[PDB]
């Protein structure tokens, strides 16, 4: 029924005579019919958070109650698409309006309603069958790589009554009917799922298959699993398309909840041009991905909704059977949005002014990822990975956001105290950086590489060692010197990836292995004692200056141009050079 | 008992966040539980938080989504939360709200207990005498735990405190002096934990066969917060019953109490109270008192309880209210050192800063062995001095070193290599720990062991 | 030039509306007249103060330092109105000036501005006390030249390498300068003295530029190379082999 608006206070709207509405039922407001979601009920009064600037709204304008809460459309065509936080097909709207301005277009179906699709029903279905539903009954053929499928919406189970034949359909044509109860039901190729719910599953399975990235820090000292939970202090984001290119993933989801406008146009521009080419046939990454779009100016409600619709699509493609890698640009923006809404509602804030239930909401954000046995007749598996981001504020190590994230995620990377080298993104703080997948990857690595375990422990030891000494050194022993310059060499060349350059676009495993192995061997061949084994550091420097320059220039071995065999042969030759140089001493 | 029919309300004054306001309520009780029927038929539950006049207030565990103003309904059981209890809950795993997560059924109620409980009579208190073997060399040797001593385990994020807890669960037991282990059980309760490292608790507990004598509780991080508030009290009630009504010693372990503090802050925010220091509620101290000190020995009985919570340090803030208060209410403490974890020592337990208050009486001639106190003192001094000698050699250089300091360095390095290292699946009785300690002590001559009386050296050093 | 004026004597509330007028006019000239414009805002702190007045008058929920919550949204509105668009000429380049209460980088206003704009150029009183006409501390500065100054088609190929090497050497120079105050000059190695000299000559030549001096990009690159020449080639840890052999000799 229609009520009348009663008040406007920024993006809030107090309306009257809306008794009977749930506090997450949607509503249309004003003659322009802006989208809204309820927050607080009181008597017949109600409170409405809108998704659009409220300028020009008059008191008393009609409000139309809609029967459903916030929801997300699903179906074919999702891949290779861009939406906003409320699932807005911006490409369609830009085509339709022929203008760079976004009107108040609140009537645009998220999925195209005209493109036909090649339906190929499963062979095992039978007319009148009492399978009592399930999940799979079809495959859509309209994609070169991502073989989309049609599944059955959950909580709806029953016997076959009619099945469409193979052929073209506009995705609104009913292709399946399950009465089963004396009441007939029809299904299209598109379903609707509430955004804030959790899709159920059969059983939560572990994660042992490893996830390998293009960063030396993570691959080296902070292993991550396929489908695990990680946090990345993104202050880089190229890792997303690096995984799309190299990692064993299928569907890539990125959500720019609060991205700066220029950099968002940047991603939108450069991203579609990348090419993938597994089987020697070039294919754009745009087919194996899907994007969500939100600049910083958009209303707060959209920024809230984007982070959830991202996970809903991730869980849809989890049920789809594939493996998914998702990452969020910045959770801190979502936290700030939650602060803004909470302060707007005039409630009592907690420490630092953040609302108390920040932690609970962040927990809800997680706990929706991992390997899983899905609900369905063809028993199969799927995975979702989540890579959140942390933006260290002025209080790098005391804000509640980093605290709450630190208490949940499994693998965490942080930066140290802010160095003068502001461009030093690959920093690592040992105080709060950790990973809990060390045990699970032992059984994988014992049959691929076993040498890196002592090397990694030595790297951690030496890093700790100068971490301990640099304090006194600011305010000596030969071993102190050897260790200090070794650690500086590691920090400067093994770490300190530019990221953007032909020499750090991606670093496969073997390059890291060679780099660290040679570095640690160089350390070991001098640390043993004054002599070569059980002179001074300066004579070592003057002899091996050229060798040290080679150690530093190891990083300039491009994998895209130089073959792996050439580069490893070069590493071995330089190892022999070190051996000859040390033996002549 | 309640001989009257229950009430059913249809009045819903309004909704505000995780609360629900009702009107026309007849004689509402403060902490009574209620159920809610939704339009789609889904069932829910909540607790009464604030009552005034005919108005009432109810917080909903499952979250207030979809509740309407006419279609929803309410129900009043007319009684505060009560829980069942019985011996047979051993071998069972619950989710904290009483529902068994295991495939098994609902436990039968041998009795019903008030969840809040009531305090101890100070006169009836009894000083602990015996001790509990822990299966960790450091915990048994450097320190000790009486039957009634409450010690926390400070740690930090990224450290393997869950794993120390799991090992303690697998290895817990009483020392056989020469009335069985049937008089020993454990109640492990984990709060606000990740899905991972929780199924790990389940699987590690199930494989070894510990289910015979463990009652387990799991509360997930994504669960309702009020469940987190309730759960540790529930587990303490169960331990209380099993240890006092039935003659049995018990060892309760609690994990990640910082999450409990967070939930306490949540409920405080719900009730509109002004935060005190650092945002934590001002009445945190009283609450933490109520949770603790439900353990010890009492007159006329034989059962006992021993309490071992786990705390997480917010970035090594030793003056943070949580660790500080827990220290003010507990006896002694144990640290976990990050540098040892970097050094790849499976038990990262540190030695120098730790301390047990009641060690002097937890051991003795009537216990495992007479020597132990002297051994502990001597090796404590040796370890401290050896750390100082490593600091010397850092600057002076080995060339200016004496033989005694070389032996001290040997003691330090072998201690680190052998004694402190334990292994995830290795067991050591207290006698073996004493023997290994004597092996370490043997490196020095008899005279260099100043701290130990000549008698003990005469018996044992040869 | 189209210009606006809000002076100190004027009523405070006008500052809320003042900048948006200028931005609307600039938007019109850029997206409609296809003119490349440059909008210079100044003293955004006064805008923040006016917003504080408005919020405090309404008894709205306050936040950090009494600032209202929603100026993050408000500053987002006032800031991103820039960048080119498809099918059109002209552009909007926006250089606002923010005064900095005391010396607080963690103050709310500059911090929030940091989260929105894609860069920042820092001014330090130290250089001003050392009589440097452009007192610009390059260490905290940062911009998204990240793929704009490539060199392929743009000015020159070495741009990023020289910039990075100067940056790192400057950082180490500041480090050794700090170490100098701890221990006397005698304890420094030859490389430490080289770093100190490089630092000194760097602010004396590169940073210190006179007013009205219109240096070209090639000129500054050459000056940078001349500064590089102070060290031998083996300390060029960041420059690739090709450029190093191309220009260093």
């Amino acid at each position: 029924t229609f009520g009348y608006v009663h008040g406007v206070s920024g993006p809030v709207v107090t309306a009257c005579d809306m008794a009977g509405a749930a506090m997450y039922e949607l509503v249309r407001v004003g003659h322009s019919e802006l989208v809204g979601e309820i927050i607080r009920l009181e008597g017949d009064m109600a409170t409405i958070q809108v998704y659009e600037e409220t300028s020009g709204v008059s008191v008393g304008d009609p409000v139309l109650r809609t029967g459903k809460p916030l929801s997300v459309e699903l179906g074919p065509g999702i891949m290779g698409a861009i939406f906003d936080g409320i699932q807005r097909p911006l490409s369609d709207i830009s085509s339709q309006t022929q203008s760079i301005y976004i009107p108040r277009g609140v009537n645009v179906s998220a999925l195209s309603r005209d493109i036909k699709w090649e339906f190929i029903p499963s062979k095992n279905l039978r007319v009148g069958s009492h399978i009592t539903g399930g999940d799979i009954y079809g495959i859509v053929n309209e994609n070169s790589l991502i073989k989309h499928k049609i599944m059955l919406p959950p909580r709806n189970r029953g016997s076959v009554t009619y099945i469409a034949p193979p052929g073209n359909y506009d995705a609104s044509d009913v292709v399946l009917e399950l009465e089963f109860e004396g009441v007939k039901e029809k299904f299209s190729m598109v379903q609707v799922w509430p955004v804030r719910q959790v899709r159920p599953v059969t059983e939560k399975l572990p994660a042992n298959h490893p996830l390998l990235t293009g960063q030396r820090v993570l691959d080296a000292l902070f292993p991550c699993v396929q489908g695990g939970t990680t946090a990345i202090p993104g202050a880089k984001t190229v890792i997303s398309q690096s995984l799309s290119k190299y990692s064993n993933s299928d569907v890539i989801i990125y959500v720019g909840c609060g991205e700066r406008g220029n950099e968002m146009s940047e991603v939108l521009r450069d991203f579609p041009e990348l090419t993938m080419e597994v089987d020697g046939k070039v294919e754009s990454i745009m087919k194996r991905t899907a994007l969500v779009a939100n600049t910083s100016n958009m209303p707060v409600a959209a920024r809230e909704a984007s982070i959830y619709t991202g996970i809903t699509l991730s869980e849809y493609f989890r049920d789809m059977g594939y493996h998914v890698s998702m990452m969020a640009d910045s959770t801190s923006r979502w936290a700030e949005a939650l602060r803004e809404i909470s302060g707007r509602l005039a409630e009592m804030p907690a420490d630092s002014g953040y609302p108390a239930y920040l932690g609970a909401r962040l927990a809800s954000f997680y706990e929706r990822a991992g390997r899983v046995k899905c609900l369905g007749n063809p028993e199969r598996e799927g995975s979702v990975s989540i890579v959140g981001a942390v933006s260290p504020p002025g209080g790098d190590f005391s804000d509640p956001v980093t605290s709450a994230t630190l208490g949940i995620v499994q693998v965490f990377w942080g930066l140290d105290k802010k160095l003068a080298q502001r461009k030093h993104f690959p920093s690592v703080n040992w105080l709060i950086s950790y990973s809990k997948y060390m045990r699970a990857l032992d059984e994988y690595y014992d049959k691929h590489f076993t040498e890196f375990v002592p090397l990694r422990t030595k790297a951690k030891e030496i890093l700790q060692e100068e971490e301990d000494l640099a304090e006194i050194v600011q305010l000596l022993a030969e071993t102190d010197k050897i260790t200090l310059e070794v650690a500086k060499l590691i920090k400067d060349d093994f770490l300190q990836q530019n990221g953007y350059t032909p020499y750090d676009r991606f670093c496969p495993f073997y390059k890291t292995v060679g780099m660290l192995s040679n570095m640690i061997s160089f350390y070991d061949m001098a640390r043993r004692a004054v002599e070569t084994t059980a002179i001074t550091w300066s004579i070592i420097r003057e002899h091996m200056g050229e060798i040290l320059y080679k150690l530093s220039s190891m990083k300039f071995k491009d994998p895209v141009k130089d073959g792996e065999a050439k580069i490893k042969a070069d590493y071995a030759q330089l190892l022999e050079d070190m051996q000859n140089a040390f033996r002549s001493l | 008992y309640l001989s009257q029919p229950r009430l059913t309300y249809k009045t819903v004054s309004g909704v505000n966040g995780p609360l629900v306001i009702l009107d026309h309520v007849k004689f509402p009780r403060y902490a009574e539980i209620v159920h809610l029927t939704l339009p789609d038929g889904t069932k829910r539950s909540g607790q009464v938080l604030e009552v005034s006049g005919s108005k009432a207030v109810v917080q909903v565990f499952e979250g207030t989504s979809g509740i309407d103003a006419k279609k929803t309904s309410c129900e009043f059981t007319g009684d505060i939360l009560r829980t069942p209890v019985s011996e047979d809950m051993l071998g069972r795993v619950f989710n904290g709200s009483g529902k068994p997560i295991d495939r098994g059924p609902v436990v039968l109620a041998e009795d019903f207990l008030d969840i809040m409980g009531q305090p101890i009579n100070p006169q009836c208190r009894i000083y602990p005498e015996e001790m509990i073997q822990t299966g960790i060399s450091a915990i048994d040797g450097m320190n000790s735990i009486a039957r009634g001593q409450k010690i926390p385990i400070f740690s930090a994020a990224g450290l393997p405190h869950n794993e120390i807890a799991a090992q303690i669960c697998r290895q817990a037991g009483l020392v056989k002096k020469s009335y069985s282990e049937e008089n020993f059980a454990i109640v492990f309760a984990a709060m606000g934990v990740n899905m991972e490292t929780a199924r790990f608790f389940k699987s590690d507990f199930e494989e070894n066969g510990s289910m015979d004598n463990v009652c387990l509780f799991l509360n997930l991080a994504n669960d309702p917060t009020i469940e987190r508030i309730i759960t540790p009290r529930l587990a303490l009630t169960t331990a209380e019953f099993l240890a006092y009504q039935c003659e049995k010693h018990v060892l309760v372990i609690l994990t990640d109490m910082s999450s409990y503090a967070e939930a306490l802050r949540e409920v405080s925010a719900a009730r509109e109270e002004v935060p005190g220091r650092r945002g934590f509620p001002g009445y945190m101290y009283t609450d933490l008192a109520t949770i603790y000190e439900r353990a010890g020995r009492v007159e006329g009985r034989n059962g006992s309880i021993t309490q071992i919570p786990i705390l997480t340090m917010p970035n090594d803030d030793i003056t943070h209210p949580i660790p500080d208060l827990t220290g003010y209410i507990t006896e002694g403490q144990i640290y976990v050192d990050r540098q040892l974890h970097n050094r790849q020592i499976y038990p990262p337990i540190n030695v120098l800063p730790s301390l047990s208050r009641l060690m002097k009486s937890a051991i003795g001639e009537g216990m495992t062995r007479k020597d132990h106190a002297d051994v502990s003192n001597q090796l404590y001094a040796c370890y401290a001095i050896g750390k100082d000698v490593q600091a010397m050699k850092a600057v002076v250089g080995e060339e200016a070193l004496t033989s005694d300091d070389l032996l001290y360095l040997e003691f330090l390095q072998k201690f680190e290599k052998n004694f402190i290292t334990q292994g995830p699946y290795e067991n050591r009785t207290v006698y073996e720990t004493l023997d290994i300690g004597w092996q370490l002590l043997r490196i020095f001559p008899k005279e260099m062991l100043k701290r130990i009386p000549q008698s003990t050296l005469s018996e044992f050093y040869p | 030039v189209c210009l606006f004026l809000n002076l100190a004597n004027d009523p405070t509330i006008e500052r809320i509306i003042t900048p948006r007028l200028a931005l609307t006019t600039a938007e019109f000239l850029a997206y409609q007249c296809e003119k490349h414009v440059l909008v210079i805002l100044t003293d955004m702190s006064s805008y923040a103060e006016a917003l504080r007045e408005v919020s405090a008058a309404r008894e709205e929920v306050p936040g950090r330092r009494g600032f209202p919550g929603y100026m993050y949204t408000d500053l987002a509105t006032i800031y991103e109105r820039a960048g080119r668009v498809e099918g059109r000429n002209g552009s909007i380049t926006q250089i606002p000036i923010l005064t900095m209460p005391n010396d607080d980088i963690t103050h709310p206003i500059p911090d929030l501005t940091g989260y929105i704009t894609e860069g920042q150029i820092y001014v330090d009183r130290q250089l001003h006390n050392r009589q440097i006409y452009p007192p610009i501390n390059v260490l905290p500065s940062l911009s998204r030249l990240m793929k704009s100054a490539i060199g392929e088609g743009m000015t020159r190929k070495d741009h990023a390498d020289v910039s990075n090497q100067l940056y790192a050497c400057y950082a180490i120079g500041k480090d050794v300068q700090a170490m100098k105050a701890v221990v006397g000059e005698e304890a420094l190695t030859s490389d430490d003295l080289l770093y100190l000299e490089f630092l000194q000559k760097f602010e004396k030549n590169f940073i210190t530029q006179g007013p009205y001096e219109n240096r070209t990009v090639y000129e500054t690159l050459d000056i940078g190379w001349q500064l590089l020449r102070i060290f031998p080639k083996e300390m060029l840890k960041r420059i690739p082999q090709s450029t190093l052999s191309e220009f260093y000799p």
Partner: peptide, 13 residues
Amino acid sequence: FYRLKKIQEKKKI
């Protein structure tokens, strides 16, 4: 703390 207490007290009206 003072500011929050002030707004809380004002909330009564």
